[PDB]
Amino acid sequence: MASGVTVNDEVIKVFNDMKVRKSSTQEEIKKRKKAVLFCLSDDKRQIIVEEAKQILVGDIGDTVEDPYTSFVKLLPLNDCRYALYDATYETKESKKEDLVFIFWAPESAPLKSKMIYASSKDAIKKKFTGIKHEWQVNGLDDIKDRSTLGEKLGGNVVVSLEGKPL
């Protein structure tokens, strides 16, 4: 009957904690999510969050190059998802820390994941606020490094993205 799907505010509880800043000398470092994935249920009436890996700002010391270049090595090539990224780009003119919304829909991902995540895409885009940019991305090769992410934020202010000079 064309019911659609709905976002439960569990997706918004993690968005709020991710979005807003707190104490700089610890809680910006390890109480901010830098990446998260949001997923359709098996029921398919709702969008949820699951174990689909969240990583913080400090975890560059514990493990990775940066959190989002770890996240693109963990994206499902055969399913469509939403993601969220707090993208840090740096220059002398501005230190831009923008929150970005991501619709992930691989060429290899199935048509009846696609059409469901695509029709509910702009319900979640109205629930989030203090997002600056959005990506519609359709395979690993559209997301495979920071330099290909910086193009879709655009301007000329992205002289560096995620601590890596471009």
């Binding site: 104490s23 700089s24 109205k126 989030f128």
Partner: protein, 375 residues
């Protein structure tokens, strides 16, 4: 306990907002001071969690919004949408809670008495900010130049301001404004790119015309020389390129655009040039201090980024001023942000002991606290 105590910085002088944290020399956000809201339904069907779209969101959402700048010239002409600019600055651009974090704000030059008090009001009654200060914008760049006395020019967006200052006080008999700047220079730039047949109209092209204004436009030192030097070159016409791969050509427009700030007669006002307005402002200052204003002309603001503009200003003002006296102009590297940078440095100072503009004291001293928590 110890934490890098993130005191907040916001600045607006002529319709360009700058914001960041106390100690940043580079802003975390810079946006044009426009708010838009729906003409009927929202940007996507039904209501959102907001249906008010500020700066970048107002600029990128054509066909749907009615819009205002709360600062349509050099004075704030609305407060009830200026509230929503600060709200979006704190909670969406900077992404902080101002509830517990002190604020440095700037008063825009040549504004009525009550403008800093209505600013003080909304910060203590609506945002609940624990301690704050409203500085005069110009003095922060005067102090960053290395003056306590001198004359400051803003030429941010929607006005050029001319502010003589003696020992931190701006002279109220001699302050001046010229209501043409970097805003209307974008529109004059497309009024002359019309001569090439570029039918520009959209915000998506105003993006590209802004990018020509920043990356391609320069002031002439001698307008006849720069025309002759261009015509005697084998290149004067040059391509710029749009992000989608399409190409547009610009030539002598690069200096025909800036030049109408040195004579508003070209865009068709009666008004005198920025050098003439600077020396008229100096001439209306007191005879025992005019001597030192000659040497201390601080160029701040977004439109001071054109090559040749300070160099031309020194060459122009030496024809106006009696040539026994000597002229000196100063235009910083970060001249684009200089007033907010001096604000960020003021924001970081903790010595509140002779201020006392706080959410205790506000409730005795009222909106006018700002005039009884200074010497």
């Amino acid at each position: 306990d110890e934490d890098e105590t993130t005191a907040l910085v916001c600045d607006n002088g002529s319709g360009l907002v700058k914001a960041g944290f106390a100690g940043d020399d580079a802003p975390r956000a810079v946006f044009p001071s426009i708010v838009g809201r729906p003409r009927h339904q929202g940007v996507m069907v039904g209501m959102g969690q907001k249906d008010s779209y500020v700066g970048d969101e107002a600029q990128s959402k054509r066909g749907i919004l009615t819009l205002k700048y709360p600062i349509e010239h050099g004075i704030i002409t609305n407060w009830d949408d200026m509230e929503k600019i600060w709200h979006h600055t704190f909670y969406n651009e900077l992404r902080v809670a101002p509830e517990e974090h002190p604020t440095l704000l700037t008063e825009a030059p040549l504004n009525p008495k009550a403008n800093r008090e209505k600013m003080t009001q909304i910060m203590f009654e609506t945002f609940n900010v624990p301690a704050m200060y409203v500085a005069i914008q110009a003095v922060l760049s005067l102090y960053a130049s290395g003056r306590t006395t001198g004359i400051v020019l803003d030429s941010g967006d929607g006005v050029t301001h001319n502010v003589p200052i003696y020992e931190g006080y701006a002279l109220p008999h001699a302050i001046m404004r010229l209501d043409l700047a970097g805003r209307d220079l974008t529109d004059y730039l497309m009024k002359i790119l019309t001569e090439r047949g570029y039918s520009f109209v959209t915000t998506a092209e105003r993006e590209i015309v802004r990018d020509i204004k920043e990356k391609l436009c320069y002031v002439a030192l001698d307008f006849e020389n720069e025309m002759a030097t261009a015509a005697s070159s084998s290149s004067l016409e040059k391509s710029y390129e749009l992000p989608d791969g399409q190409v547009i050509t610009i030539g002598n427009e690069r200096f025909r655009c800036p030049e109408t700030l040195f004579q508003p007669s070209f865009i068709g006002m009666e008004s005198a040039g920025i050098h003439e307005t600077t020396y008229n402002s100096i001439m209306k200052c007191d005879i025992d201090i005019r001597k030192d204003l000659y040497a201390n002309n601080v160029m701040s603001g977004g439109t001071t980024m054109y090559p040749g503009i300070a160099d031309r200003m020194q060459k122009e003002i030496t024809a106006l001023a009696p040539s026994t006296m000597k002229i000196k102009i100063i235009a910083p590297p970060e001249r684009k942000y200089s007033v907010w940078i001096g604000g960020s440095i003021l924001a970081s100072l903790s010595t509140f002991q002779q201020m006392w503009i706080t959410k205790q004291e506000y409730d005795e001293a009222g909106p006018s606290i700002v005039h009884r928590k200074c010497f």
